[PDB]
Amino acid sequence: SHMETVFTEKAPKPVGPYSQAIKVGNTLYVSGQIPIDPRTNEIVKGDIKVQTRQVLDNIKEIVKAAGFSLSDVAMAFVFLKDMNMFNDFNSVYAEYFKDKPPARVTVEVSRLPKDALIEIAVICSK
Amino acid sequence: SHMETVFTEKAPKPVGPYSQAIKVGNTLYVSGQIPIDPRTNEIVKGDIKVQTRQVLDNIKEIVKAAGFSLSDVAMAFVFLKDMNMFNDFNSVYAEYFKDKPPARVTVEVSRLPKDALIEIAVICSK
Amino acid sequence: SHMETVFTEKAPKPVGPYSQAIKVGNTLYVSGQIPIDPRTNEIVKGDIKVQTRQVLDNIKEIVKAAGFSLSDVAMAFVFLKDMNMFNDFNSVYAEYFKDKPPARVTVEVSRLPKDALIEIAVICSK
């Protein structure tokens, strides 16, 4: 009832039974985003840094569409194909969460959708 | 204090230090469910589709026991043993979340409890 | 705005763009903790049981610093390097959550930060 679907054309269009995000009042639940360019609907060319920047940009557009801001991210779930890429991922991530950074979970998985190097999901509270 | 344990005999009986779900007012936190038949306490026979249907049925019974409905699922965490099974998993999942589908996180893990093909945990808000 | 960063010297000091936890009113989001001894900033010597006890102690100190208690843990995300260690992990975990235990998600990942055997993140509500 107070649950709302969030959609923006500025982040990858959901194909299937999920929403980019679900807003319930001052809480936002954001889907695990992968490095899809919304212009092509395919993974962006580049290394972990380019992919991380694409993911966080996807998340930023979703969060902003919902009336939230990156500052409202309380908890981030970070899934890496390769934990050795952590330092490089982290240097880009640090750009987006400079102050009052969210709680974070970081693990290495064996594979991601579209063979992504990284997927990030967040929960926000404003 | 306003935290409540949720239990139903219609979903796998917890063996150990966890609850099927925890309800706090209009928010429900649901344990990662695996394809256990509550009748046998063992994994159901069948492929990813049969296992996915068992998991979602387990989640549905927990959610309903708690006074919630699948419509209240805001965020789903989906862990697959094999990302190549995604399309098949998704065809069953799509049956349970037809309208206003939840935010979703989907990754491939190296192994699950009882060597399950899939485990799903959800957060709901009503 | 009502979002607050949580920090205690009694749990591993964040190095980088994350907070040990984020408190928003009666909800706490806690980072995935690994078996770092805050005295050394390195992984503790020992098997899964010693590592699990270090992780849960880290989580306990964060939760207490925030004005919460382990009793307020609603949902735990448990990531194991090796699912065969589950029974041993569980025997220690059972010590910390004796009554009204949280909802739990448990999966095996291919690797963790610092090659940890286990990482745990929690969400609490008081």
Coordinates of C-alpha atoms in Angstrom, one line a residue:
Chain A
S1 CA 0.0 0.0 0.0
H2 CA 2.6 2.6 1.0
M3 CA 5.0 0.4 -1.1
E4 CA 5.9 2.1 -4.4
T5 CA 7.8 0.8 -7.5
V6 CA 10.6 3.1 -8.6
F7 CA 11.6 3.3 -12.3
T8 CA 14.0 5.5 -14.3
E9 CA 15.1 5.3 -17.9
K10 CA 18.5 6.6 -16.6
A11 CA 19.3 3.1 -15.1
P12 CA 19.0 -0.4 -16.7
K13 CA 15.4 -1.3 -17.7
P14 CA 14.2 -4.3 -15.7
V15 CA 13.5 -7.3 -17.9
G16 CA 11.5 -9.6 -15.8
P17 CA 9.8 -9.9 -12.3
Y18 CA 11.8 -7.2 -10.4
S19 CA 11.7 -3.4 -9.8
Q20 CA 14.8 -1.2 -9.9
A21 CA 13.8 -0.2 -6.4
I22 CA 11.0 -0.3 -4.0
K23 CA 10.2 2.7 -1.8
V24 CA 8.3 2.5 1.4
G25 CA 8.1 6.0 3.0
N26 CA 11.6 7.0 4.0
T27 CA 13.2 3.6 3.2
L28 CA 14.4 2.5 -0.2
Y29 CA 15.3 -1.0 -1.2
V30 CA 17.5 -1.0 -4.4
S31 CA 18.0 -4.1 -6.7
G32 CA 21.6 -5.5 -7.1
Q33 CA 22.8 -3.3 -10.0
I34 CA 25.4 -4.7 -12.5
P35 CA 27.6 -2.7 -15.0
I36 CA 24.9 -2.4 -17.7
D37 CA 24.9 0.8 -19.8
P38 CA 21.2 1.8 -20.0
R39 CA 22.0 3.1 -23.5
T40 CA 22.9 -0.4 -24.8
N41 CA 21.4 -2.7 -22.2
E42 CA 24.8 -4.5 -22.2
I43 CA 27.8 -4.6 -19.9
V44 CA 30.1 -1.6 -20.3
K45 CA 33.6 -2.1 -21.9
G46 CA 36.4 -1.8 -19.3
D47 CA 38.0 -3.1 -16.1
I48 CA 36.8 -3.2 -12.5
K49 CA 37.0 0.6 -12.2
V50 CA 34.8 1.4 -15.3
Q51 CA 32.4 -1.3 -14.2
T52 CA 32.2 -0.1 -10.6
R53 CA 31.6 3.5 -11.8
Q54 CA 28.8 2.2 -14.1
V55 CA 27.2 0.3 -11.2
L56 CA 27.3 3.2 -8.8
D57 CA 25.9 5.6 -11.5
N58 CA 23.0 3.1 -12.0
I59 CA 22.4 3.1 -8.3
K60 CA 22.7 6.9 -8.1
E61 CA 20.1 7.4 -10.8
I62 CA 17.7 5.0 -9.1
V63 CA 18.2 6.6 -5.7
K64 CA 17.6 10.1 -7.2
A65 CA 14.5 9.0 -9.2
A66 CA 13.1 7.8 -5.8
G67 CA 13.6 11.2 -4.1
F68 CA 16.7 10.0 -2.2
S69 CA 20.3 10.8 -2.4
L70 CA 23.6 8.7 -2.1
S71 CA 23.9 10.3 1.3
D72 CA 20.8 8.3 2.3
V73 CA 22.5 4.9 1.6
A74 CA 22.6 3.1 4.9
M75 CA 23.8 -0.4 3.9
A76 CA 25.6 -1.6 0.8
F77 CA 25.9 -5.2 -0.3
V78 CA 29.0 -5.5 -2.6
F79 CA 29.6 -8.7 -4.6
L80 CA 32.9 -9.1 -6.4
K81 CA 33.8 -11.8 -9.0
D82 CA 37.4 -11.3 -7.7
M83 CA 38.5 -10.1 -4.2
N84 CA 41.9 -9.1 -5.7
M85 CA 40.0 -6.2 -7.4
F86 CA 38.9 -4.9 -4.1
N87 CA 41.4 -2.0 -3.8
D88 CA 40.6 -0.8 -7.3
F89 CA 36.8 -1.1 -6.7
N90 CA 37.3 0.7 -3.4
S91 CA 39.1 3.7 -5.0
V92 CA 36.1 4.4 -7.2
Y93 CA 33.5 3.6 -4.5
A94 CA 35.3 6.1 -2.2
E95 CA 34.3 8.9 -4.7
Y96 CA 30.6 8.2 -4.2
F97 CA 30.5 7.9 -0.4
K98 CA 32.8 10.5 1.0
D99 CA 31.1 11.5 4.2
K100 CA 29.1 9.3 6.6
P101 CA 29.7 6.3 4.4
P102 CA 27.2 3.4 4.6
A103 CA 27.6 0.1 6.4
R104 CA 29.0 -2.3 3.9
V105 CA 29.1 -6.1 3.2
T106 CA 31.8 -7.3 0.8
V107 CA 32.3 -10.8 -0.5
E108 CA 33.6 -12.7 -3.5
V109 CA 31.1 -14.7 -5.5
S110 CA 31.8 -17.4 -8.1
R111 CA 29.7 -15.6 -10.8
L112 CA 27.4 -12.7 -11.5
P113 CA 24.6 -11.9 -14.0
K114 CA 26.1 -11.2 -17.5
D115 CA 29.5 -12.3 -16.0
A116 CA 29.9 -8.9 -14.3
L117 CA 33.0 -8.2 -12.2
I118 CA 30.7 -6.5 -9.6
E119 CA 27.1 -6.2 -8.4
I120 CA 25.9 -3.7 -5.7
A121 CA 22.5 -3.6 -3.9
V122 CA 21.7 -0.9 -1.3
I123 CA 19.2 0.0 1.4
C124 CA 18.6 3.7 2.0
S125 CA 16.8 5.7 4.8
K126 CA 16.1 9.4 4.5
Chain B
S1 CA 10.3 -5.8 22.5
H2 CA 8.2 -5.1 19.5
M3 CA 10.3 -7.8 17.9
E4 CA 8.4 -11.1 17.4
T5 CA 9.5 -14.6 16.3
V6 CA 7.4 -16.1 13.5
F7 CA 6.8 -19.9 13.3
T8 CA 4.7 -22.1 11.0
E9 CA 4.6 -25.9 10.7
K10 CA 3.9 -25.2 7.0
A11 CA 7.6 -24.2 6.3
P12 CA 10.8 -26.0 7.3
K13 CA 11.2 -26.3 11.1
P14 CA 14.3 -24.3 12.3
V15 CA 16.9 -26.7 13.7
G16 CA 19.2 -24.4 15.6
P17 CA 19.7 -20.7 16.6
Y18 CA 17.5 -19.0 14.0
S19 CA 13.8 -18.1 13.5
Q20 CA 11.9 -18.6 10.2
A21 CA 11.3 -14.9 10.4
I22 CA 11.4 -11.9 12.7
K23 CA 8.5 -9.4 12.6
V24 CA 8.9 -5.9 13.9
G25 CA 5.6 -4.0 13.4
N26 CA 5.1 -3.6 9.6
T27 CA 8.5 -5.0 8.6
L28 CA 9.3 -8.7 8.3
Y29 CA 12.8 -10.2 8.0
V30 CA 12.6 -13.7 6.5
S31 CA 15.5 -16.3 6.8
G32 CA 17.2 -17.6 3.6
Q33 CA 14.9 -20.5 2.7
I34 CA 16.1 -23.6 0.8
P35 CA 14.1 -26.3 -1.1
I36 CA 13.3 -28.4 2.1
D37 CA 9.9 -30.1 2.0
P38 CA 8.5 -29.4 5.6
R39 CA 6.8 -32.9 5.3
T40 CA 10.2 -34.7 5.1
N41 CA 12.7 -32.1 6.4
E42 CA 14.8 -32.9 3.3
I43 CA 15.5 -31.3 -0.1
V44 CA 12.7 -31.9 -2.7
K45 CA 13.4 -34.2 -5.6
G46 CA 13.7 -32.3 -8.9
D47 CA 15.5 -29.6 -10.9
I48 CA 15.9 -25.8 -10.4
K49 CA 12.2 -25.2 -11.2
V50 CA 10.9 -27.7 -8.6
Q51 CA 13.4 -26.4 -6.0
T52 CA 12.5 -22.7 -6.8
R53 CA 8.8 -23.5 -6.3
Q54 CA 9.5 -25.3 -3.0
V55 CA 11.6 -22.3 -1.8
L56 CA 9.0 -19.7 -2.7
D57 CA 6.2 -21.8 -1.2
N58 CA 8.3 -22.0 2.1
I59 CA 8.6 -18.2 1.9
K60 CA 4.9 -17.7 1.1
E61 CA 3.9 -19.8 4.2
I62 CA 6.2 -17.8 6.5
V63 CA 5.1 -14.5 5.1
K64 CA 1.4 -15.5 5.5
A65 CA 1.9 -16.9 9.0
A66 CA 3.3 -13.4 10.0
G67 CA 0.2 -11.6 8.7
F68 CA 2.0 -10.5 5.5
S69 CA 1.5 -11.4 1.9
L70 CA 3.9 -11.9 -1.1
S71 CA 2.8 -8.5 -2.3
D72 CA 4.6 -7.1 0.8
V73 CA 8.0 -8.4 -0.3
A74 CA 10.2 -5.3 -0.8
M75 CA 13.6 -6.9 -1.4
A76 CA 14.6 -10.5 -2.3
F77 CA 18.2 -11.9 -2.0
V78 CA 18.5 -14.8 -4.5
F79 CA 21.5 -17.1 -4.3
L80 CA 22.0 -19.6 -7.1
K81 CA 24.4 -22.5 -7.2
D82 CA 24.5 -22.0 -11.0
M83 CA 23.8 -18.7 -12.8
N84 CA 23.0 -20.7 -16.0
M85 CA 19.8 -21.8 -14.2
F86 CA 18.7 -18.2 -13.9
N87 CA 16.2 -18.2 -16.8
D88 CA 14.5 -21.3 -15.4
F89 CA 14.5 -20.0 -11.8
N90 CA 13.1 -16.7 -13.2
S91 CA 10.2 -18.4 -15.0
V92 CA 8.9 -19.8 -11.7
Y93 CA 9.7 -16.7 -9.6
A94 CA 7.7 -14.6 -12.1
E95 CA 4.6 -16.6 -11.0
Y96 CA 4.9 -15.5 -7.5
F97 CA 5.6 -11.8 -8.0
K98 CA 3.4 -10.7 -10.9
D99 CA 2.7 -7.1 -9.9
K100 CA 4.9 -4.4 -8.2
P101 CA 7.7 -7.0 -8.0
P102 CA 10.3 -6.6 -5.3
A103 CA 13.8 -5.2 -5.6
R104 CA 16.1 -8.2 -6.2
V105 CA 19.7 -9.2 -5.7
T106 CA 20.9 -12.3 -7.7
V107 CA 24.3 -13.9 -7.5
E108 CA 26.0 -17.3 -7.9
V109 CA 27.5 -18.8 -4.8
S110 CA 29.9 -21.8 -4.6
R111 CA 27.6 -23.8 -2.4
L112 CA 24.4 -23.7 -0.3
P113 CA 23.1 -25.6 2.8
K114 CA 22.2 -29.2 1.9
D115 CA 23.7 -28.6 -1.6
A116 CA 20.6 -26.7 -2.6
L117 CA 20.4 -25.2 -6.2
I118 CA 18.9 -22.0 -4.7
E119 CA 18.3 -20.1 -1.5
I120 CA 16.1 -17.0 -1.1
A121 CA 15.7 -14.5 1.8
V122 CA 13.3 -11.6 1.8
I123 CA 12.5 -8.4 3.6
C124 CA 8.8 -7.3 3.6
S125 CA 7.0 -4.1 4.5
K126 CA 3.2 -3.8 4.8
Chain C
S1 CA 19.7 13.5 8.8
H2 CA 18.4 11.0 11.5
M3 CA 21.2 8.8 10.0
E4 CA 24.1 8.4 12.4
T5 CA 27.6 6.8 12.0
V6 CA 28.5 4.4 14.7
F7 CA 32.2 3.9 15.8
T8 CA 33.9 2.0 18.6
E9 CA 37.6 1.3 19.2
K10 CA 36.4 -2.0 20.6
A11 CA 35.8 -3.4 17.0
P12 CA 38.0 -3.2 13.9
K13 CA 38.7 0.4 12.8
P14 CA 37.3 1.1 9.3
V15 CA 40.0 1.7 6.8
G16 CA 38.2 3.3 3.8
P17 CA 34.7 4.4 2.7
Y18 CA 32.5 2.5 5.2
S19 CA 31.2 2.9 8.7
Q20 CA 31.1 0.0 11.3
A21 CA 27.4 0.7 11.4
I22 CA 24.7 3.1 10.5
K23 CA 21.9 3.9 13.0
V24 CA 18.6 5.4 12.0
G25 CA 16.4 5.7 15.0
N26 CA 15.5 2.2 16.2
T27 CA 17.1 0.4 13.2
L28 CA 20.8 -0.4 13.0
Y29 CA 22.6 -1.5 9.8
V30 CA 26.0 -3.3 10.7
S31 CA 28.8 -3.8 8.2
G32 CA 29.9 -7.4 7.3
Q33 CA 32.4 -8.1 10.1
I34 CA 35.5 -10.4 9.6
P35 CA 37.7 -12.1 12.3
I36 CA 40.0 -9.1 12.8
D37 CA 41.3 -8.6 16.2
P38 CA 40.9 -4.8 16.8
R39 CA 44.2 -5.0 18.9
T40 CA 46.3 -6.0 15.9
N41 CA 44.1 -5.1 12.9
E42 CA 44.7 -8.6 11.6
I43 CA 42.9 -11.9 11.4
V44 CA 42.9 -13.9 14.6
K45 CA 44.9 -17.1 14.8
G46 CA 42.6 -20.2 15.0
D47 CA 39.9 -22.3 13.3
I48 CA 36.3 -21.5 12.3
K49 CA 35.3 -21.5 16.0
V50 CA 37.8 -18.9 17.1
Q51 CA 37.1 -16.8 13.9
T52 CA 33.3 -17.0 14.5
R53 CA 33.7 -15.9 18.1
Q54 CA 35.9 -12.9 17.0
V55 CA 33.3 -11.9 14.4
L56 CA 30.4 -12.0 16.8
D57 CA 32.4 -10.1 19.4
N58 CA 33.1 -7.5 16.8
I59 CA 29.4 -7.3 16.0
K60 CA 28.5 -7.3 19.7
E61 CA 30.7 -4.3 20.4
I62 CA 29.3 -2.4 17.5
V63 CA 25.7 -3.1 18.4
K64 CA 26.4 -2.1 22.1
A65 CA 28.2 1.1 21.1
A66 CA 25.1 2.0 19.1
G67 CA 22.8 1.6 22.1
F68 CA 21.5 -1.8 20.8
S69 CA 21.9 -5.3 22.1
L70 CA 22.4 -8.7 20.4
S71 CA 18.8 -9.3 21.3
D72 CA 17.9 -6.6 18.8
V73 CA 19.4 -8.5 15.8
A74 CA 16.6 -9.2 13.5
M75 CA 18.4 -10.6 10.4
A76 CA 21.9 -12.0 10.0
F77 CA 23.8 -12.5 6.7
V78 CA 26.3 -15.3 7.2
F79 CA 29.0 -15.9 4.5
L80 CA 31.2 -19.0 5.0
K81 CA 34.3 -19.9 3.0
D82 CA 33.4 -23.5 3.5
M83 CA 29.9 -24.9 4.2
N84 CA 31.4 -28.0 5.8
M85 CA 32.3 -25.7 8.7
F86 CA 28.6 -24.9 9.3
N87 CA 28.1 -27.1 12.3
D88 CA 31.1 -25.7 14.1
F89 CA 30.2 -22.1 13.2
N90 CA 26.7 -22.8 14.4
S91 CA 27.8 -24.1 17.8
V92 CA 29.5 -20.8 18.6
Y93 CA 26.8 -18.7 17.0
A94 CA 24.2 -20.5 19.2
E95 CA 26.0 -19.0 22.3
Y96 CA 25.3 -15.4 21.2
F97 CA 21.6 -15.8 20.1
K98 CA 20.0 -18.1 22.6
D99 CA 16.5 -16.6 22.7
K100 CA 14.3 -15.2 19.9
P101 CA 17.2 -15.8 17.5
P102 CA 17.3 -13.6 14.3
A103 CA 16.2 -14.5 10.8
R104 CA 19.4 -15.9 9.1
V105 CA 20.8 -16.2 5.6
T106 CA 23.7 -18.7 5.2
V107 CA 25.7 -19.3 2.0
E108 CA 29.2 -20.4 1.0
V109 CA 31.2 -17.8 -0.9
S110 CA 34.4 -18.4 -2.9
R111 CA 36.5 -15.9 -0.9
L112 CA 36.3 -13.2 1.8
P113 CA 38.3 -10.1 2.7
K114 CA 41.7 -11.1 4.2
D115 CA 40.9 -14.8 3.3
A116 CA 38.5 -15.0 6.3
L117 CA 36.7 -18.3 7.0
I118 CA 33.5 -16.2 7.8
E119 CA 31.9 -12.8 7.5
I120 CA 28.7 -11.7 9.2
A121 CA 26.5 -8.6 8.7
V122 CA 23.3 -7.8 10.6
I123 CA 20.3 -5.6 10.7
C124 CA 18.9 -4.8 14.2
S125 CA 15.6 -3.2 15.3
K126 CA 15.0 -2.1 19.0

